[PDB]
Amino acid sequence: EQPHIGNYRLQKTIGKGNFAKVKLARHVLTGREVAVKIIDKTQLNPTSLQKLFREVRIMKILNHPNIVKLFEVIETEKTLYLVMEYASGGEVFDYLVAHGRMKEKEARAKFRQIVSAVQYCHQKYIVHRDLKAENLLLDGDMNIKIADFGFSNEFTVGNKLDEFCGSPPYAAPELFQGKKYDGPEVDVWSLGVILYTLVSGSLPFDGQNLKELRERVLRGKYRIPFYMSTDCENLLKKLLVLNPIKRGSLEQIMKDRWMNVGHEEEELKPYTEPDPDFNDTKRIDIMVTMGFARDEINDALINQKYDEVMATYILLGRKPPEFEGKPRSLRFTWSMKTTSSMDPNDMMREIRKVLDANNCDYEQKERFLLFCVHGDARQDSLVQWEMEVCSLPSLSLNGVRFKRISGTSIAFKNIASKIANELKL
């Protein structure tokens, strides 16, 4: 029986991977929603267990509105639990699944938040090294929420790193060569791969094998589409520079023309951390009435070890759940390809038939939600995802929400697109 861990009631899985799985949960004392990353302690070798100490250490010190925040760390002998901020809006590549290549003015809104977060990290001498699409999540307001610092580490001027941990398509060419790197320049490369992909719909480098992907990456030439602005193409000449010394630093990037069109007054400036507010008396007096002793509270916030007591206090300064006095009414990136007037239960009968024809297996979980799976794990093509029928802000219109649980974004986009093209609603 595992419905609970610590003070949390665990819910569905919202993320899965080779060595970690994430579940949505509700804190039982304060009602807030969280994501719980479940790391199995028995399958770690010397290197992965040094990454996990680096991961919890680094998340303890980042405090930025577009970086997933840590709430509590709970340990057992064989399992480690990181309780963190739940990003309920999906991932930034959902725009490309739903709508294809993004408009530069919309890509700029997210890329300003991504660069703000990533440069805030580089200002605290932290490099992410896994800035790939799967790690750019969105909250309920579609704000960027950068996640999974598992491959992350600190850097110091004068010292160099040698690990290669991130995804090959987003990896700077120094990594492909086994070359000792300085750090923050491999994220600046990797952000150029992200921006090229959001405004063009596909990755800048790709081959049908790693040797071809490596060769294309090292030559550093990508396709300039007809619809791409000079401004955007001049910025990628600052991100995708083959020589790491010649690549801009994100401080310069912030002052690039393309990142500030539409923002002439408010230019993108380095984010300055707020001041630590570990003495909010309203939240302390709420905790004492929930059964915590004032001294235990004060000590826990001075010791800063992300235990039960510190977790309740952080969670209290998050928006409470709304007071309580059939498809869901949700705000998601709907598309006219999947919007319809048809009765939702016949919408699911249609969704289930199309899944069968493209050899997708699924399991019904709620009245309007399926968990779907397609591909073969040998071909790096296995992908799992949710499909839910949700209402839109009108009278009888409903859509189909796709959310990836597992698998590559590339493979998710292929299978989700093909289902959406063939839904007849």
Q: What are phi and psi of 361, to 5 degrees?
A: -95, 150
Helix axes 409-422, 344-357, angle to 10 degrees: 120
Q: Strands, DSSP E only, in 181-244?
A: none
CA-nearest of 166, 36, 89, 39 to 390 is 89
H/E run at residue 14? strand 8-16
Residues 334 and 401: their CA atoms lie apart, in Å, by: 7
CA-nearest of 329, 296, 327 to 310 is 296
Residues 412 and 354: their CA atoms lie apart, in Å, by: 16
Residues 341 and 269: their CA atoms lie apart, in Å, by: 46
Cβ contact 373:405 at 8 Å: no
Cβ contact 179:188 at 8 Å: no
Question: Two tokens at 266?
Answer: 């408010």
Is there a binding annotation on residue 115? no
Q: What are phi and psi of 46, to 5 degrees?
A: -50, -35
**Alpha-carbon separation of residue 91 from 146, 225, 321, 343, 413 (angstroms):** 10, 24, 23, 28, 12
What single string gives the DSSP state of each residue in 101-125? S--HHHHHHHHHHHHHHHHHHHHTT
Residues 44 and 39: their CA atoms lie apart, in Å, by: 10
For residue 38, the 8-state DSSP code is: E
Residues 401 and 420: their CA atoms lie apart, in Å, by: 10
Cβ contact 368:387 at 8 Å: no
Cβ contact 155:161 at 8 Å: yes
Is there a binding annotation on residue 111? no
Cβ contact 95:140 at 8 Å: no
Is there a binding annotation on residue 21? yes
The residue segments making up the domain with residue 244 are: 90-259
Beta sheet of 4-5, edge-to-edge order: 4-5, 8-16, 20-27, 33-40, 79-84, 70-75
Cβ contact 81:34 at 8 Å: no
Residue owning tokens 């977790």: 311
Residues 17 and 37: their CA atoms lie apart, in Å, by: 11
Q: What are phi and psi of 358, to 5 degrees?
A: -100, 20
H/E run at residue 154? strand 153-154
Q: How many residues does the chain have?
A: 425
Residues 401 and 333: their CA atoms lie apart, in Å, by: 8
Question: Two tokens at 86?
Answer: 């739940």
CA-nearest of 390, 293, 379 to 333 is 390
**Alpha-carbon separation of residue 321 from 12, 26, 145 (angstroms):** 18, 10, 20
CATH number of domain containing 232: 1.10.510.10
Residues 14 and 23: their CA atoms lie apart, in Å, by: 5
Q: How many CB atoms neighbour CB 276 within 10 A?
A: 9
Is there a binding annotation on residue 37? yes
Is there a binding annotation on residue 19? yes
Cβ contact 385:405 at 8 Å: yes
Residues noted as catalytic: 130
Is there a binding annotation on residue 15? yes
CA–chain centroid gap for 238, Å, is 24
Instruction: List CB contacts of 230: < 8 A, sequence separation 6 or more.
Output: none
Is there a binding annotation on residue 18? yes
Residues 151 and 409: their CA atoms lie apart, in Å, by: 19
Longest dimension (CA), the chain: 65
Residues 56 and 86: their CA atoms lie apart, in Å, by: 17
Dihedral angle sign, alpha carbons of residues 230, 232, 233, 234: positive
Q: How many CB atoms neighbour CB 383 within 10 A?
A: 23
Residues 56 and 339: their CA atoms lie apart, in Å, by: 42
Give the resolution in Å: 2.5
CA-nearest of 264, 225, 270 to 252 is 270
- Three-point CA angle 285, 290, 295, nearest 5°: 55
Experimental method: X-ray
Is there a binding annotation on residue 194? no
CA-nearest of 202, 185, 48 to 128 is 185
